Amino acid sequence: PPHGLLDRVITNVTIIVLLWAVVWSITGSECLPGGNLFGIIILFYCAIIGGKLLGLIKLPTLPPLPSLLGMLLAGFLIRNIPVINDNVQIKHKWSSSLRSIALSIILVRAGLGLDSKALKKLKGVCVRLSMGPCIVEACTSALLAHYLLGLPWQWGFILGFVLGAVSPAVVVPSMLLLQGGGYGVEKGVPTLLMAAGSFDDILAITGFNTCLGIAFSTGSTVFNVLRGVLEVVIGVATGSVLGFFIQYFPSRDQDKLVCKRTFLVLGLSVLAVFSSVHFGFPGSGGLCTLVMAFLAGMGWTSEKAEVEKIIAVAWDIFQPLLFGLIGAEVSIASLRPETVGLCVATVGIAVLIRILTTFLMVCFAGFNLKEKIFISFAWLPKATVQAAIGSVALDTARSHGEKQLEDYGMDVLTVAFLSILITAPIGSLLIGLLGPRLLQKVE
Amino acid sequence: PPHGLLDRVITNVTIIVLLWAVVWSITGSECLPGGNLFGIIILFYCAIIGGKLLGLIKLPTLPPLPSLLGMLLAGFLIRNIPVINDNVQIKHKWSSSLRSIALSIILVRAGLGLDSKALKKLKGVCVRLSMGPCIVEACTSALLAHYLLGLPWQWGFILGFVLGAVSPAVVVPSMLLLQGGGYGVEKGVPTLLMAAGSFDDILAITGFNTCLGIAFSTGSTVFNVLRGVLEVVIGVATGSVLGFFIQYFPSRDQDKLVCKRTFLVLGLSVLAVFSSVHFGFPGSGGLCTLVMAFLAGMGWTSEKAEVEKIIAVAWDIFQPLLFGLIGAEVSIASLRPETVGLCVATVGIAVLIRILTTFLMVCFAGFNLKEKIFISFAWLPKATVQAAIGSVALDTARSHGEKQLEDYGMDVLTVAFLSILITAPIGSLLIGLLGPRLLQKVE
Amino acid sequence: DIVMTQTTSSLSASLGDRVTISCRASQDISNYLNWFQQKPDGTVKLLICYTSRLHSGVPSRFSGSGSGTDYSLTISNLEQEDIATYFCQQDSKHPWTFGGGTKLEIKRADAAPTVSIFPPSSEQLTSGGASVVCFLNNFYPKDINVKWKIDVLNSWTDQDSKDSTYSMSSTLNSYTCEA
Amino acid sequence: DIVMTQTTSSLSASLGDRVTISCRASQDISNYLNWFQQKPDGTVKLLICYTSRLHSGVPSRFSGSGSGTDYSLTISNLEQEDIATYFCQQDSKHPWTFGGGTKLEIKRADAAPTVSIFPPSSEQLTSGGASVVCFLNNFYPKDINVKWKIDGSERQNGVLNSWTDQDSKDSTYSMSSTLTLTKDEYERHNSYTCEA
Amino acid sequence: EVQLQESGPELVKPGASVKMSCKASGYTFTNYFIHWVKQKPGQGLEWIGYINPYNDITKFNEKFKGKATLTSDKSSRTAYMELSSLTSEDSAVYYCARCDGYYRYYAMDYWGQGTSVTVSSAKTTAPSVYPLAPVTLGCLVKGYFPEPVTLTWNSGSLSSGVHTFPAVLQSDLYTLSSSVTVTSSTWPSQSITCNVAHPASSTKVDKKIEPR
Amino acid sequence: EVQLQESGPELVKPGASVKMSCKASGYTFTNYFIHWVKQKPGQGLEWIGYINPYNDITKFNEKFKGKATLTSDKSSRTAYMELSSLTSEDSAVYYCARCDGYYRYYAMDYWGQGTSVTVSSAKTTAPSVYPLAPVTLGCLVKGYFPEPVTLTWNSGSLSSGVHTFPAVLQSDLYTLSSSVTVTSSTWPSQSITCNVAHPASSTKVDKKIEPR
Ligand SMILES: CCCCCCCCCCCCCCCC(=O)OC[C@H](COP(=O)(O)O)OC(=O)CCCCCCCCCCCCCCC
Ligand SMILES: CCCCCCCCCCCCCCCC(=O)OC[C@H](COP(=O)(O)O)OC(=O)CCCCCCCCCCCCCCC
């Protein structure tokens, strides 16, 4: 009977073909070239295959390249090869929804994986790490843009803020892997990085929104600033109430305890994210999910392990979708060689300054030199916020009908895409490498 | 802390509300009154609640009423109460797809649960039980319709054939429950009833189609008859190849063996059903699913138990949907007292003759009197085919623009609905009652 | 398709007698000859479904007898609100077809039109138009003849509700109008 | 509302000189003053994007100089295929506004129209109409005037004029005038004269 | 009770499209068929087609296949008919009636109020009053596009002899004509005038009719 | 090579609606913007609006807001414009041009061929040809609706002096006016008769010119 590599490959290809055929039979034209579901399925498969292929290649001393690069390249190729792009189209609504769901899953994972005892003893450190680097990188990015790119100050700051938020989708999985091996959980480095990861897109989005309002002279800056404070407050409050709720009611006496708990956390996080977006407070959803998951994990001292295992499986399913869609958002039109050199220079210098500032922001936290270096190099990744708000400035400029503002929006979009491309894979690789070396393993 | 009944009810209501809220947040208007998803979710919940409520009530000696009655009544009320019906609308495509998926699930369950050794020793018995009763009940139903209802002979036979196919959705679950307790698996009664269950709609549908063609003088009868033989042949062939395939390739050496096997069987069955419907051979899908599942189970001598457990969970999820939709298909317009008395009389006499004929068809199979009686009373249920093809004759008559033929189609539809209502619950109850008594338990 | 024809397009009747509108099918109608009544103001109500099944709320005076292919509708006694146009419809076959309708004129003694002639107004001549008008009204029955002895726009009035008469208006140096 | 004004609607040019089309904007567009060319057959091609950035494939003779709010397009030398209508467009603001257009007429010696007379034919009257047409052809430049001396009197109603674009061979012009009048009006006159 | 209300009279130009609505109240909308009947003046009614407002299946008379498009809205309880490429023939009154599709003896049994559609080219025009004198007298309102002139006389002249003949259309110009009958002995001095009240042009013209 | 093809000339009645298409080949359709420009005769061009054939966001000039409805179909590779409630002033040529939305110096680099739209109510009519005599002579084609006339003379007649003035509206009666110049010595027996070939009415008329 068949066995070995041939059996595995035949089973996998049959499963892929069968999934597509089932979807086509149920739906019909929607799962044929030019259809939404066909595009989604093809993007999913291509992202998975690219991740695996990139993981396979390891010629030099360094470990294999991350699957993030494979997924991003798969999406990029699907978008920027005309023949494939014509037959692979995904509605914007579906892409946004899938990316939001992936964000919810990863935020739940991060919240469940935090350590309460460690998080208690590093409070100021987390605040500094979440605030300082973003603001300093935004300021220096605006300074660079005003000179290399010629942008005015308002647009320079729009660029800085849209280039100043790290992606939990890149940081959380790697730090969770490290925490699984106990590689740095003696001072709480994984907890510090996972906690601060989710509070960095409320300072970035708020700054970007207020600067955009100033640039287009629309509305008021006071309300735009206060929106961020309100987002923080309502996120914390909703997360607290929901976490204390699910922490108690699903009780040890119920039969399907694990299934009910996982459904509750996942559904509540997804509902929080989507409803917050709907009601005009985007960013309180992530904080609410983080707080709720953290409190629920505190409630289930050790019974949460199965919940996080199921969520990890869900994340393994959803990561290819997220990163393939992020890659598909970018087009070679933005990355044209007219001025791409200066955009790359600005992104590079901004990243260097961000690393330098992150090193300084953790100086007085009691960490050793190696931990400081690891934290500095584990805080660069930038994937999700940049893709979410990358083209908003250009769209607003287009709506207003101006032409110079369109040029500025084009520069902002180019910078965002370059930052994603040259920061997500390098950051993931650097975390994977420097984890075992610089962090003190525990038993 | 909370515990007991209050905790269970609060958790369940919160889960229900959370599911609806998550779907609404993701989708939007589609999960609000008058929306498709809102209707589907409300129908699902109402069917579940009705099933549980009906199961609760048991005043007399007989056990509690079946959940089928609760689900059917939930769908019926949702359809026939104007205020609820206005806000609860489900697209016909979605209803058809969900019913087909439920049929696929139950057919897979039946196929996996068959016994090869028993099925070998009762071959003629299965053929007789699948053929005789359907044809005799169709003939007697046509005879009754021609006199009580005044229908011509062609329409009488259309009625007989649309009233002559039992539902595996009602028979298979009960016989599987009996087989779980080993209540009749010494001569193979559960296998006999489950096997014959999925070959009774190829003859019924074929007879109905040919008689409809004769009545409307469309096409040719030869091709309509040959379609059934072709359906049988291609169903058997496709089932054989697919079953021998999945019986071997997913190997003992693979990690996620159970998950891959369950996905393979379910996806292949769903694909078979839907593709057969699409290509114009409706009915070969069910036979293909039955044969494929049977052969796969033969391949996995004892490792299939987990697969059927997962499929049983899926069926527990999907049964409320199937029966709620079936109930929602019927409207009080058909069940008007103009001539409902004669329709009820015809259905009743046809069912009595069906029982009498089923008793005779198993006379020479070696069964004892009690087994013969149980088989006779376990072969009446009629739920799925009747709802699928109940209104086809009326639709064809409407399309042709005739008026007398519309009257005949109305009579056919009334008979189909009455048969469903007064046969599915009685049949389920009778199986549940007579199982333990008439069947010889094994250890 | 089936063509329904009604012999009489204007059934003259009194206010207290029995009338019978007859509808004749074309090929064959089993009993599918619904009857409709349309009032002069334009409101149409269903009277009888399936040959004789009197509809709910319709007065018992409406007896829809007649079967086979010769169909009929009868009014036991007439009343002022029974004057309308009655249509016979068939739904036996696909394209539903209505009859030509029947108007229930009320009987009265014959009259003679006034046949007045109005030469175009002097203001009209200065305007540029030249339209002569003949006004002959308060006549009965509908049978009239228009002729000119000169040296066309024709409009009729509905049956007068008070005196059950009719009016004719016609439009076009010694101008004479005769009829 | 950045309405763009081109001072000259038709500038005469020889076949070997440097022409300069001037376009001015009613506002301050920085440099977004794309130039377009439309040929007589109706084909329009982009010429110069962003003031002076010559487009790909366009001959080097075109130079889009000019800045501020007063731009200009220049032809180093005039070719026979250069004869067309040139539009200046601005995309600085939301409503993209095009210029009035400029027509390049080839300069030549001044001519005089033939101004022939054509009284309505017998078919006109039998048909039920009466049309008088003047045929003055091969005149230069386009500076012409149309007038009528019907029985001495001048009527300014019922006149149809159709012009012919610059002649591609002799660079001349043609004027077509047609008058539709009542038959009775013609019946009272027999001598028809056309002057210009 | 059950009542169907449809849109009001509409004016269209030839080659244009018109969408008329029919809103039903007093019963379950989705449980009945909606049938459309066109009654051109002079001729009797004539079936157009129907739509099932439960699954939206439409059957059309082969004469109107293409000319009419039937749609329905469950939420609004209204059914729409879309008429395309309107011509002179398409000008008539259109009815919507319901019909129980699952009753062995179904009929219409409930009709709308009518929806006059006029396909013409002219636009709003002010009516012209032409007083007429030699007993009787009328003002013979001349051409006007909009239909509802609502011609009326002063109170007192409406007692008798007020035959108001219907506005006959001709050359896309409705030509109403009225007359008033009064004894000759009562016409030495008349203070009677037909007050034309064309609302579309809002021209409340009187044009006092005088003896000639 | 990249080119855009639009629909042919179309004639519509006033108040109707017209759809015009623009099919783009030679490049990635969804990668550029589709801009619509209307050029009325005599006047200059007028920017109507644009459609982004990647996510379907349209920007409209305030003047043409409501009058135009822009849509696109990636599969069909075409962009459509809707012109509702046409008018005599909506009769003009319409262009579709692409523009690179993500280039800092974008413009409309490639244009369509034009789509003449005529909004009138007349109907196809046979042109009327009238021989003209006193040198030269003309035909003076009279009223006719469409412009496929393509007036021509016999072979060799068009050698010189064949000025064919453009067709003029003339109250929905288009009218050419041709001329032929020949010497007197060559006109004792003239075989030069203009052959009007209006194909819409297929009225191939000759109307031999006679030497009055
Ligand atoms: C608790 C309720 C759970 C019920 C199930 C939820 C829906 C999933 C079942 C899908 C069948 C109904 C919709 C099919 C699409 C349609 O009919 O209609 C097809 C429609 C387009 O036609 P419409 O005009 O009707 O919208 O396409 C869609 O809208 C896409 C819908 C997304 C889901 C399609 C893919 C479903 C694949 C599910 C595989 C199931 C495997 C077996 C599971 C055990
Ligand atoms: C392997 C691929 C799996 C990817 C996931 C499949 C799709 C399920 C995710 C839904 C999000 C995208 C579509 C949302 C509908 C939309 O955007 O668009 C909403 C559309 C209507 O708008 P459109 O015009 O775009 O079709 O509605 C629909 O078509 C209904 C689609 C059926 C599915 C809706 C319900 C999904 C609920 C899923 C809950 C997920 C919980 C978390 C899981 C871990």
PDB file of C-alpha atoms in Angstrom, chain D residues 109-171:
ATOM      1  CA  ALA D 109      -1.838  85.151 -49.757  1.00  0.00           C
ATOM      2  CA  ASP D 110      -5.138  86.941 -49.238  1.00  0.00           C
ATOM      3  CA  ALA D 111      -7.936  85.861 -51.578  1.00  0.00           C
ATOM      4  CA  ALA D 112     -11.451  86.955 -52.508  1.00  0.00           C
ATOM      5  CA  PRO D 113     -14.574  84.768 -52.534  1.00  0.00           C
ATOM      6  CA  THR D 114     -16.309  83.940 -55.799  1.00  0.00           C
ATOM      7  CA  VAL D 115     -19.741  84.757 -54.285  1.00  0.00           C
ATOM      8  CA  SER D 116     -21.824  82.979 -56.924  1.00  0.00           C
ATOM      9  CA  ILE D 117     -25.623  83.235 -56.926  1.00  0.00           C
ATOM     10  CA  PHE D 118     -27.973  80.247 -57.186  1.00  0.00           C
ATOM     11  CA  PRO D 119     -31.689  81.083 -57.362  1.00  0.00           C
ATOM     12  CA  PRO D 120     -34.006  78.255 -56.302  1.00  0.00           C
ATOM     13  CA  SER D 121     -34.583  75.698 -59.030  1.00  0.00           C
ATOM     14  CA  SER D 122     -37.990  74.844 -60.454  1.00  0.00           C
ATOM     15  CA  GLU D 123     -37.913  71.694 -58.317  1.00  0.00           C
ATOM     16  CA  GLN D 124     -37.870  73.853 -55.180  1.00  0.00           C
ATOM     17  CA  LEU D 125     -41.180  75.519 -56.028  1.00  0.00           C
ATOM     18  CA  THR D 126     -42.854  72.320 -57.234  1.00  0.00           C
ATOM     19  CA  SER D 127     -41.661  70.548 -54.077  1.00  0.00           C
ATOM     20  CA  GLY D 128     -43.133  73.337 -51.950  1.00  0.00           C
ATOM     21  CA  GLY D 129     -39.955  75.084 -50.832  1.00  0.00           C
ATOM     22  CA  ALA D 130     -37.816  78.029 -51.902  1.00  0.00           C
ATOM     23  CA  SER D 131     -34.121  78.114 -50.959  1.00  0.00           C
ATOM     24  CA  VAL D 132     -31.578  80.657 -52.212  1.00  0.00           C
ATOM     25  CA  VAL D 133     -27.889  79.872 -51.730  1.00  0.00           C
ATOM     26  CA  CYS D 134     -24.737  81.950 -52.188  1.00  0.00           C
ATOM     27  CA  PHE D 135     -21.512  80.115 -53.065  1.00  0.00           C
ATOM     28  CA  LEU D 136     -18.482  82.276 -52.265  1.00  0.00           C
ATOM     29  CA  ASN D 137     -15.376  80.092 -52.304  1.00  0.00           C
ATOM     30  CA  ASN D 138     -11.584  80.314 -52.131  1.00  0.00           C
ATOM     31  CA  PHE D 139     -11.280  83.367 -49.894  1.00  0.00           C
ATOM     32  CA  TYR D 140      -8.632  84.286 -47.349  1.00  0.00           C
ATOM     33  CA  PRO D 141      -8.493  84.917 -44.431  1.00  0.00           C
ATOM     34  CA  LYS D 142     -11.679  83.807 -42.615  1.00  0.00           C
ATOM     35  CA  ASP D 143     -12.763  87.460 -42.284  1.00  0.00           C
ATOM     36  CA  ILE D 144     -16.049  87.433 -44.188  1.00  0.00           C
ATOM     37  CA  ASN D 145     -19.491  88.983 -43.778  1.00  0.00           C
ATOM     38  CA  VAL D 146     -22.871  87.711 -44.976  1.00  0.00           C
ATOM     39  CA  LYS D 147     -25.656  90.049 -46.070  1.00  0.00           C
ATOM     40  CA  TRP D 148     -28.786  89.952 -48.213  1.00  0.00           C
ATOM     41  CA  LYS D 149     -30.367  92.536 -50.509  1.00  0.00           C
ATOM     42  CA  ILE D 150     -33.760  90.930 -51.138  1.00  0.00           C
ATOM     43  CA  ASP D 151     -35.550  93.498 -53.314  1.00  0.00           C
ATOM     44  CA  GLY D 152     -33.132  95.958 -51.728  1.00  0.00           C
ATOM     45  CA  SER D 153     -34.393  95.059 -48.263  1.00  0.00           C
ATOM     46  CA  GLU D 154     -32.178  93.197 -45.794  1.00  0.00           C
ATOM     47  CA  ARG D 155     -33.664  90.228 -43.920  1.00  0.00           C
ATOM     48  CA  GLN D 156     -31.847  88.804 -40.887  1.00  0.00           C
ATOM     49  CA  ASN D 157     -34.014  85.685 -40.498  1.00  0.00           C
ATOM     50  CA  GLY D 158     -34.002  82.240 -42.067  1.00  0.00           C
ATOM     51  CA  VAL D 159     -30.297  82.202 -42.969  1.00  0.00           C
ATOM     52  CA  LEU D 160     -28.152  79.053 -42.904  1.00  0.00           C
ATOM     53  CA  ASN D 161     -24.359  79.367 -42.955  1.00  0.00           C
ATOM     54  CA  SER D 162     -21.864  76.499 -43.168  1.00  0.00           C
ATOM     55  CA  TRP D 163     -18.098  77.013 -43.295  1.00  0.00           C
ATOM     56  CA  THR D 164     -15.344  74.731 -44.554  1.00  0.00           C
ATOM     57  CA  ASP D 165     -12.196  74.229 -42.518  1.00  0.00           C
ATOM     58  CA  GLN D 166      -8.821  75.293 -43.876  1.00  0.00           C
ATOM     59  CA  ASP D 167      -8.228  73.709 -47.268  1.00  0.00           C
ATOM     60  CA  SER D 168      -5.395  71.197 -47.041  1.00  0.00           C
ATOM     61  CA  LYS D 169      -4.189  71.923 -50.596  1.00  0.00           C
ATOM     62  CA  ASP D 170      -4.495  75.658 -51.333  1.00  0.00           C
ATOM     63  CA  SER D 171      -5.057  76.774 -47.716  1.00  0.00           C
TER      64      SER D 171
END
